[PDB]
Swiss-Prot record, chain A:
Mitochondrial membrane ATP synthase (F(1)F(0) ATP synthase or Complex V) produces ATP from ADP in the presence of a proton gradient across the membrane which is generated by electron transport complexes of the respiratory chain. F-type ATPases consist of two structural domains, F(1) - containing the extramembraneous catalytic core, and F(0) - containing the membrane proton channel, linked together by a central stalk and a peripheral stalk. During catalysis, ATP turnover in the catalytic domain of F(1) is coupled via a rotary mechanism of the central stalk subunits to proton translocation. The gene is ATP16. One of its GO terms (biological process) is proton motive force-driven ATP synthesis. GO terms for cellular component: mitochondrial inner membrane; mitochondrion; proton-transporting ATP synthase complex. It is found in: Mitochondrion; Mitochondrion inner membrane. It comes from Saccharomyces cerevisiae (strain ATCC 204508 / S288c) (Baker's yeast). This is ATP synthase subunit delta, mitochondrial. Keywords: ATP synthesis, CF(1), Hydrogen ion transport, Ion transport, Membrane, Mitochondrion, Mitochondrion inner membrane, Transit peptide, Transport.
Swiss-Prot record, chains B, C, D, E, F, G, H, I, J, K:
This is ATP synthase subunit 9, mitochondrial. Coiled coil: none annotated. Gene3D superfamilies: F1F0 ATP synthase subunit C. It comes from Saccharomyces cerevisiae (strain ATCC 204508 / S288c) (Baker's yeast). PANTHER family: ATP SYNTHASE LIPID-BINDING PROTEIN, MITOCHONDRIAL, ATPASE PROTEIN 9. Belongs to the ATPase C chain family. Keywords: CF(0), Formylation, Hydrogen ion transport, Ion transport, Lipid-binding, Membrane, Mitochondrion, Transmembrane, Transmembrane helix, Transport. The modification N-formylmethionine is found at residue 1. The chain crosses the membrane at residues 14-34, 52-72.
From Swiss-Prot, chain L:
It comes from Saccharomyces cerevisiae (strain ATCC 204508 / S288c). F-type ATPases have 2 components, CF(1) - the catalytic core - and CF(0) - the membrane proton channel. CF(1) has five subunits: alpha(3), beta(3), gamma(1), delta(1), epsilon(1). CF(0) has three main subunits: a, b and c. PANTHER family: ATP SYNTHASE EPSILON CHAIN, MITOCHONDRIAL (PTHR12448), ATP SYNTHASE SUBUNIT EPSILON, MITOCHONDRIAL (PTHR12448:SF0). It holds the Pfam family ATP-synt_Eps. This is ATP synthase subunit epsilon, mitochondrial. It is found in: Mitochondrion; Mitochondrion inner membrane. GO terms for molecular function: proton-transporting ATP synthase activity, rotational mechanism. The gene is ATP15.
Amino acid sequence: SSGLKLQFALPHETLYSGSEVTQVNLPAKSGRIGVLANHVPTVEQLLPGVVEVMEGSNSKKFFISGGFATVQPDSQLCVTAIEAFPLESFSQENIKNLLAEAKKNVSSSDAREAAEAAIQVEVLENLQSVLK
Amino acid sequence: MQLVLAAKYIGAGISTIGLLGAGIGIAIVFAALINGVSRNPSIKDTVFPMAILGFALSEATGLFCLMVSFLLLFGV
Amino acid sequence: MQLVLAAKYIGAGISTIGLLGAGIGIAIVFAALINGVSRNPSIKDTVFPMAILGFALSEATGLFCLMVSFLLLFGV
Amino acid sequence: MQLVLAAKYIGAGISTIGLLGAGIGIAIVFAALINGVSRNPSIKDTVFPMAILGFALSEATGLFCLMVSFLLLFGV
Amino acid sequence: MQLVLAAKYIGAGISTIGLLGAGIGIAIVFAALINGVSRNPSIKDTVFPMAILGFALSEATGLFCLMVSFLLLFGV
Amino acid sequence: MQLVLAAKYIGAGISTIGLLGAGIGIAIVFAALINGVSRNPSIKDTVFPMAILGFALSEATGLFCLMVSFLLLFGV
Amino acid sequence: MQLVLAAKYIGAGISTIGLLGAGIGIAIVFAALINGVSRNPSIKDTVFPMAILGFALSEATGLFCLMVSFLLLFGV
Amino acid sequence: MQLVLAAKYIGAGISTIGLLGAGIGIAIVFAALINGVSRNPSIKDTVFPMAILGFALSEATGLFCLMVSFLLLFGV
Amino acid sequence: MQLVLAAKYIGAGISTIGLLGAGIGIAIVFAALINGVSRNPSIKDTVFPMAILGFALSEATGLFCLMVSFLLLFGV
Amino acid sequence: MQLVLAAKYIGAGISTIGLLGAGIGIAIVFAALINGVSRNPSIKDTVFPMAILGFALSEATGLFCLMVSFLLLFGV
Amino acid sequence: MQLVLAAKYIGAGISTIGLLGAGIGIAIVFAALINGVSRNPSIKDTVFPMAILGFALSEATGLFCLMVSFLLLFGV
Amino acid sequence: SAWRKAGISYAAYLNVAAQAIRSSLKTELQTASVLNRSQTDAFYTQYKNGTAASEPTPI
């Protein structure tokens, strides 16, 4: 058995399924993690960050919403999330600031709704660093 | 003067023991920066600058005990 | 005076050993701030200020033992 | 008196070694507060007050050994 | 008496080194309470009381070695 | 007797250094109980009793070295 | 005999320093049993027996260095 | 012979300090077996045998420094 | 020769202190192998061989300081 | 000159103790790079360069205490 | 020459204490490679080479302090 | 900013990020598939042991 089979799927669309990958970089609660061919079976919670599937050829990088990641004993990593995001040609700085700024005003609004605003701030700030 | 001169060398070799705080101390402070970026590659130009600040703080113990040796060999 | 003068240098080189508490001590206190901000970039202007407070607390051992050396070389 | 006077300086430089407990000790106690708030920003006005309590407990070793040096230089 | 009197000060400055067990010791015991209330704020009136019990246990080394210094300066 | 009497005080101040094993030792043993209940409060009347057993084991080093000081001050 | 007798007390107070291995040593060995049950209480009558075995192994350093003190005070 | 005989006792009490490597050393090696089987009871007859092998390796420092004391008390 | 002969025993008992690096050193290196296979039973014939390599590297400090004692007792 | 010359060798053997900060210090700093790359292979040409920077910082304690020995053997 | 010759052996037995940095130091550096590949056996020909680099860095303290002993026994 | 304290389940924690992301992109590359993917008109009602019920509310 050479390589590791990746299974990156979503509740609306499936990207990778039993596909061999050289390396993957997905943010974890404990901290940023990396995986290669043979990797010790670890089960960590994925936080709203950025994942990058590596290949012998140029590797593509997509933004992830969050979920779980588990590396099966048989050398098989499984990534589960909600929504996905392409390189940068998909997101727009202008489209982000609009809501982003409105989030700070949600703290001003009733706390019941401001609770979700705090969670948005984080995700939004990370979107800016993706611009690179 | 001979008995008091000999104490100048004995006291200088002991003041070097106080420099362990800078060897192991600065080690831990710098080691945290290495283990931090492995957990959060995003934040770099924020932890790096403060990391250097911790250096001068831990370098203190490596300067005071260092001056004590010169005040017993080239000072007195 | 010669025998008692020699003890002034021997005692000064040993009082530097007590400065290890400031080298390794301040190291751990500062290292925690590095491990903290690399796990939670949100809370910065809250842990940073208190981190400095821990500095002066651990700097104590680096001042007392530091004064003892001067009270044996430039004091007595 | 000369032989006994010299022992006053030698004993004072060694009593500073006992102050390491306050340098590294208070460091760990304060470091825990830094690693606690970076992992649990919610609880602050609960761990902060008790953290200070641990300071006075670890500051003990930094006071006793500190007084011993004065009882050999400005005391006896 | 002069030679034996001088040994009273030398032995008193060394008995302070044994107080490190209370500085770093109590530090770890108290630090655990800080690390414990950060991952589980629920259990407080259960770990806090026992934490104090560990204090008196580690304070022992800070009392015995403390009495030894008085038995060489204000005792003998 | 004077030269041999002076060695009774010097040897007593050094035997206190061996009491560090009880300060830091008992600290770690007790600290584990704190970090343990914070991870699993279910098991209390099982780890608490054994924790005390570890106390008497680590208290040994704090008794032997403690008796050595009395055998040089109030013994000999 | 007086000069050689005095060395019997000085050497006895230093042999107590070797007992630190039993204070901190047994501490870590016993501490592992505490942190191990907090993660998996299923295995108790398996780790507990072996834990005691580690005690006698680490108690060695606390016996040899302990006998050395008696061979200088009540032996020689 | 008297001055050289006294050095036989002073050197024997210091060679016991080298036995700390066996107290704390064997402690860590044995402690790993305790934290290991807990996290994974599946592997026992594989880590247990090798664990004993590490004992004899760390027991070395507890034998050499142990023989040095006999070569100064019952040897020379 | 008598004064220089006595220094042969005093220097031999101190060279044993340098053997702590092999007691605690080899302990950590071997302890990692225990905490490695308990979390990854798969890999064994890969970490085991390299683990032994680390032994000879840490055994160095336990050989050099060991030879120094023989060069003062059965050498010189 | 003979009594003061002898203190040149005694003080040189003690200044080597201050080199522990470079042995254990650089160890921790380098060890972090090993635990970092095994957790995040991506960030290599970022942590590797800074890791070397920490080397020269911790190598300081291994140079100062190293020069002190030459200023007592081939210097003075 | 006799009084100065005796200091050659006393200073040689103390310079061995500085070799602890290589025993425990290299231990931690090598131990990281064991724990690192236990969580990611794939990466091997990347951490293994750098691991050896850390060896020569920590071996420094085990060479300098090693040469100091020869400059007091077979040098001077 | 605690989510598991006074926020919501982990399912909701990733939910807020799913809509924030899907709404952080271009308005041109935003198919109707994503629009209705963030739209819902379901209301919940708590019932008693006697067929009773509580005032209806939006999910």
